[PDB]
Amino acid sequence: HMRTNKDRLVRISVVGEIAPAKMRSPYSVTTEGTVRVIPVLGGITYNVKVGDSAYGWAGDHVEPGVSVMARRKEEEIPLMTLSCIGNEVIVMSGDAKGSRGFVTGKHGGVNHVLVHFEEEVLGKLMVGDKILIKAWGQGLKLLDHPDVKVMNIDPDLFEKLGIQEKNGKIHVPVVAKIPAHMMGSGIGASSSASTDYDIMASNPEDLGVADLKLGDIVAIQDHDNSYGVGKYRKGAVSIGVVVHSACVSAGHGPGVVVIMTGDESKILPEEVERANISDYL
Amino acid sequence: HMRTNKDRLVRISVVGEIAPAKMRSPYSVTTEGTVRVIPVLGGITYNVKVGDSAYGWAGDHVEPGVSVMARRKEEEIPLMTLSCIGNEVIVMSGDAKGSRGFVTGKHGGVNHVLVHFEEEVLGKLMVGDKILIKAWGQGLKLLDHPDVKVMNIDPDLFEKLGIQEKNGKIHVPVVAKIPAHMMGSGIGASSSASTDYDIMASNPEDLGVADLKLGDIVAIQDHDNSYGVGKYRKGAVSIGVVVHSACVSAGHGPGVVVIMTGDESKILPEEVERANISDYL
Amino acid sequence: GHMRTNKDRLVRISVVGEIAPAKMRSPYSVTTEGTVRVIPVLGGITYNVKVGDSAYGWAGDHVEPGVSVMARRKEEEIPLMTLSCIGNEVIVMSGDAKGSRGFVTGKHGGVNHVLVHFEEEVLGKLMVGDKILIKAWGQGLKLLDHPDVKVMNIDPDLFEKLGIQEKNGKIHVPVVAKIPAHMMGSGIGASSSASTDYDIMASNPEDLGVADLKLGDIVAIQDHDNSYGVGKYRKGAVSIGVVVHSACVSAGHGPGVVVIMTGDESKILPEEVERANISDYL
Amino acid sequence: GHMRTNKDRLVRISVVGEIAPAKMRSPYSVTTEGTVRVIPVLGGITYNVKVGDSAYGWAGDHVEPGVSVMARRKEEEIPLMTLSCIGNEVIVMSGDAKGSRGFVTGKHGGVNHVLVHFEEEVLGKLMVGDKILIKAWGQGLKLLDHPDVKVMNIDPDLFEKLGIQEKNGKIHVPVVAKIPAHMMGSGIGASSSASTDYDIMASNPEDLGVADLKLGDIVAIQDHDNSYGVGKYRKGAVSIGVVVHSACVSAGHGPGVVVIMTGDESKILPEEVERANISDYL
Amino acid sequence: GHMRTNKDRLVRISVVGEIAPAKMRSPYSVTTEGTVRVIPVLGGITYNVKVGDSAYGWAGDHVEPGVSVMARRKEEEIPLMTLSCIGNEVIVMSGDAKGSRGFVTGKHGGVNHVLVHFEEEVLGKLMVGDKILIKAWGQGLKLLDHPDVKVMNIDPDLFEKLGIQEKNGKIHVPVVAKIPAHMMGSGIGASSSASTDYDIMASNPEDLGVADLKLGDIVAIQDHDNSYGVGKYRKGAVSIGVVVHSACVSAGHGPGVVVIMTGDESKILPEEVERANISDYL
Numbered sequence A, B: 001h002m003r004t005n006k007d008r009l010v011r012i013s014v015v016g017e018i019a020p021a022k023m024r025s026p027y028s029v030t031t032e033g034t035v036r037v038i039p040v041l042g043g044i045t046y047n048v049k050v051g052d053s054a055y056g057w058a059g060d061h062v063e064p065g066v067s068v069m070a071r072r073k074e075e076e077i078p079l080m081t082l083s084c085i086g087n088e089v090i091v092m093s094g095d096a097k098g099s100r101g102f103v104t105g106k107h108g109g110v111n112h113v114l115v116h117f118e119e120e121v122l123g124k125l126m127v128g129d130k131i132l133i134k135a136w137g138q139g140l141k142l143l144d145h146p147d148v149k150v151m152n153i154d155p156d157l158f159e160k161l162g163i164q165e166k167n168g169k170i171h172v173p174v175v176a177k178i179p180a181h182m183m184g185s186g187i188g189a190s191s192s193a194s195t196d197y198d199i200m201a202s203n204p205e206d207l208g209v210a211d212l213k214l215g216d217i218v219a220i221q222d223h224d225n226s227y228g229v230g231k232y233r234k235g236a237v238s239i240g241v242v243v244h245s246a247c248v249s250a251g252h253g254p255g256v257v258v259i260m261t262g263d264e265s266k267i268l269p270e271e272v273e274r275a276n277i278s279d280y281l
Numbered sequence C, D, E: 001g002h003m004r005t006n007k008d009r010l011v012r013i014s015v016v017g018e019i020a021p022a023k024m025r026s027p028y029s030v031t032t033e034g035t036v037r038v039i040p041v042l043g044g045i046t047y048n049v050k051v052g053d054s055a056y057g058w059a060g061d062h063v064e065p066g067v068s069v070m071a072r073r074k075e076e077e078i079p080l081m082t083l084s085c086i087g088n089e090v091i092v093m094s095g096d097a098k099g100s101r102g103f104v105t106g107k108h109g110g111v112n113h114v115l116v117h118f119e120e121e122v123l124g125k126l127m128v129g130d131k132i133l134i135k136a137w138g139q140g141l142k143l144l145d146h147p148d149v150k151v152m153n154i155d156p157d158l159f160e161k162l163g164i165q166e167k168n169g170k171i172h173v174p175v176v177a178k179i180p181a182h183m184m185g186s187g188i189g190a191s192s193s194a195s196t197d198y199d200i201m202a203s204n205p206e207d208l209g210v211a212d213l214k215l216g217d218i219v220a221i222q223d224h225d226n227s228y229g230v231g232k233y234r235k236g237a238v239s240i241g242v243v244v245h246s247a248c249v250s251a252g253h254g255p256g257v258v259v260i261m262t263g264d265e266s267k268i269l270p271e272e273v274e275r276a277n278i279s280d281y282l
């Protein structure tokens, strides 16, 4: 595997609490201009989890597993910025205390970090239980590929994604390559370190695949995400992880957290049948 | 049973706490313009339960069993929208921690979800104890009856109501058929998903029945509740569940949460002697 | 002449508010068919909808004719909404229209607005925030010969001009329409008919058997008693009211009615006529 | 003549705000190259940038032409941003320029400013905090013969002067540029195209195949439906918008566009011409 | 003539504040010697200390000459402090001196005040809380032939009058003193040199090898880079600034300096002269 500065990274406690189910209205507004009453984001979601399809749920912006929010507003930036996909998460109060899980993703706006625990643990969790995330990953650098930025990813998880260097190029398995024009909500966020942005496909076939799953690794064509999110640049490529379900409103759909960005000459995405972080929990 | 998208519905944690008895004034104003000092809504109500008469109590808007409110205002909409009659409820703090009950109803305005627990649990409960509702049911669809909307009901409970797809209609057992003109407070609420509305009958005999009980299934003639509450339309029909006691004030009476709505060419209410959710919970 | 009343014993009192902004809790209004529309809603100075115009046909929801008046603060809403009576004198007390006079045409519960008509030339001088004084007068009014007929929400001088006639112990009241109990929705169950309107939920006038319904029209509501709380169904009760705001797109809503009289059908006799509108008297 | 509309049914209503201060959440603006610049940003009376000027070339980020108008308080934001339409009459209601009249040029979401053009002589008299009245008019407009073509955010009188032509059932719209879906960024996903703009994320006009793009220019956005929410990619959809603020230094950002028409390419035919700017009619 | 700049592309924008009261967090000021004194501090209209006077010799601490201007609210502080440039035009917008014009002489971080000179007859009519309009112009200024020399915090018209001379690729700057890195104190570490001053922590002018140091003087700071954050030691860097407030009694504090130029010693050549004070050009 690739040379990194992993040993120089700071490992720090990032605190939050299990978020309630949130809804700003009973209605979700469709792209057809109709309204529907369906579940949305937040909470412990009992029957949707990393590995499941992002499509086909009667729900909007559904977050798999356990949604974690800040204790207060001032604690949001660090929660959303330092938490990396794959980081270890420990429940620190309530009946599941001491149980361990993994960060599967994060979602900007409401600012939730999303966590996979094993099935048995879910029944003992309660909204408000204290959550400790052992944040580790921001600051990571590929020592031999200085023009390839990495972010939002636990360095140990990073090594399990099947990425190979060959001839000063990085080969990255992905389930799908997403055109620039299919990206929507979240473009223009200040930092790709602290939010996801949306693939705005209503159906997976619109991306040319039979399914898109929570946890999938995808490529986003012609987007640089080095600082702010979603700069269109022909020849840019980003790699990301799918983190929340399909949405009903215009401009929204399955969220993606960027883990790698740079130029097509250095990053080579390779389509495979399966590339999903749940295989390496 | 009928074909539903049940396996596509999202099951999510909705939190609250046991609400105190609430009164904005010592007096309740009657429709005769007199004042009475009687108990009202909220709390743990020890001797009024789902299955009891909605009429004959020295009280106003009395909520059977345990009234559950939100931790805070922002959490009211999800509490009231996502909670469905029949959903499993777990006590998460205090002396009855671990005890399980069922949602019987919900009440808009104060925004309480109403919950039945076994008798032995009530004596251990305290105002402020934490409550978890495993919310499940909004989004439910009859796949062979697209113009019949269902809402506010746990899909397992729905299956037990004796509803049958017969002779090209959905037949629904109810204890009474309530004329449009007997509906009052709550008409015009933004969503039928997040509130009840009132049968404004002072006496069960005004509806042509000897009694109306908490938990009863009723039809409301000539009202559509597809989106907002209480649209008069000749030939619409709604089905609902009685959720709180009679009331003393003009335009108020036992509340009804809607569970089904559509046109009389598709829904046939069948008037029977007994149709009450407590028979299944 | 006119019905005997306790009008000299009524207290006349200063009720204060300010011109309300246009209000919207969402860009969208949700229709009874479950679709969304982006349209103007309530509050403000509404420049082109006034008492006398149709309640129907506007691309708007809950449109309030003329000038909407809100309380300075929450504690002041109950008296604003309770004491203000249709026909009461209103005076602008700050801004460029200072000194201009108008009349209360209605009031709308929920947001708690009192609605006011000024002459057209005043409107272009008004600004949201301008202080408003309502010389409130009417609540406590009684028909001394008809103790079982309650009146409310109406300036006693305007009440005398409505063409209401007492004849052989019965009160004849000109109305443009007789609305069945089942056509009433939002507002039923409000704590007091003295402090709110409630909605005729007809999408179209034709649903009420009339070709048009106007802002300012006097209507009967059949089988509703409004003596204390709003909208008690009672077979044989009748209420008389004034239309105060425009039609609505959402389920259970429609042109608002403020009740001015309520009692039994043996005593109140609505007579359906071609015209009955408060704009003719102010 | 002009396309048939429901314009006589539209409600015209007072929408209030105040001149916003210049706003900056940090001294620094972060570039797409990951460096920092200290430059002016949004809000205020901007004395030397106006509708008709280039959107590019300013040492500024998200610069708003003319006078930026904000809500008096949070609850008044939705109506300010939803009901205010490009072209609507604006009147200064306090301070030294009281009585001065201008026009809405645009609006900008997030900070929620409505953007207003006044004549140059006025600008020097304005002060942050001066009360502003927008005679809001236009949401709800419908093309009665083109029900699948949605119009929005535009004063009906201005709409009639834009050079739009109905010929053989198709609507021809002059535009200065046709922008591909993928050049659109910040704002995609906004809840309603009625209450915000969204960004053309081009660092240089040349990235759009044109030499300049001006504040007030009418543009086409290819393959975006904006009927309800903002920025739905759909092949064959077309949207027409007005450029309303300056270029930006950060990733995903750029001159903002307020949508004024959206529908299908079979009905809306954008025609690229040498000039199409609302400043010519204001 | 003048150095080539991007001045035509700079955004000029309304920056609002109000006249600050005199501020004291305690009756006492703590000296470097560990004793306390009761003396006037910052804020207010200071009637007898003005740009051009000595920064030393006052029985006071952190005294701000002329009129101190603060934000209306905290959200407004960053733009007040960032965009306001020394030399910018200032207009009084309420009170008895309404219409009077003055000039920004400086700005002081922490309390976050912008300091302003009006002519003497104006001061007597001013009141704490009077509204103030700063026509902010100058952030974003670039020297187009000297890309590694950064300028900031200065009105481009004032900049052109300071007697700076480009000669053979080098910038000669008249200064009254050259201050070594180690004499700079409070403020080092501030996030941006665009929004704050920092302190020459000399308790006496003689500690800098000069007989006096005046409010308004131009000085060089040796071996400090102020390109981004304040006060980076770097051997060979040079910064130029303006003295903006009086001497101070506490450890680490002293007359404040707003940086106006920063870069390398091979490009910026400070020339120590007898007089170099911005009061000569207002």
Ligand SMILES: [Cl-]
Pocket: A048, A049, A050, A064, A065, A066, A104, A115, A116, A117
């Ligand atoms: Cl999961």
Ligand SMILES: [Cl-]
Pocket: A144, A145, A146, A147, A148, A266
């Ligand atoms: Cl590289």
Ligand SMILES: [Cl-]
Pocket: B048, B049, B050, B064, B065, B066, B104, B115, B116, B117
């Ligand atoms: Cl119960």
Ligand SMILES: [Cl-]
Pocket: B144, B145, B146, B147, B148, B266
């Ligand atoms: Cl059907």
Ligand SMILES: [Cl-]
Pocket: B179, B180, B181, B222, C182
């Ligand atoms: Cl009926």
Ligand SMILES: [Cl-]
Pocket: C049, C050, C051, C065, C066, C067, C105, C116, C117, C118
């Ligand atoms: Cl009117």
Ligand SMILES: [Cl-]
Pocket: C145, C146, C147, C148, C149, C267
């Ligand atoms: Cl009587």
Ligand SMILES: [Cl-]
Pocket: B181, C180, C181, C182, C183
């Ligand atoms: Cl009826």
Ligand SMILES: [Cl-]
Pocket: D049, D050, D051, D065, D066, D067, D105, D116, D117, D118
């Ligand atoms: Cl302008």
Ligand SMILES: [Cl-]
Pocket: D145, D146, D147, D148, D149, D267
């Ligand atoms: Cl069409």
Ligand SMILES: [Cl-]
Pocket: A181, D180, D181, D182, D183, D223
């Ligand atoms: Cl495209």
Ligand SMILES: [Cl-]
Pocket: E049, E050, E051, E065, E066, E067, E105, E116, E117, E118
């Ligand atoms: Cl001075």
Ligand SMILES: [Cl-]
Pocket: E145, E146, E147, E148, E149, E267
């Ligand atoms: Cl240089």
Ligand SMILES: [Cl-]
Pocket: E180, E181, E182, E183, E223
């Ligand atoms: Cl030194």
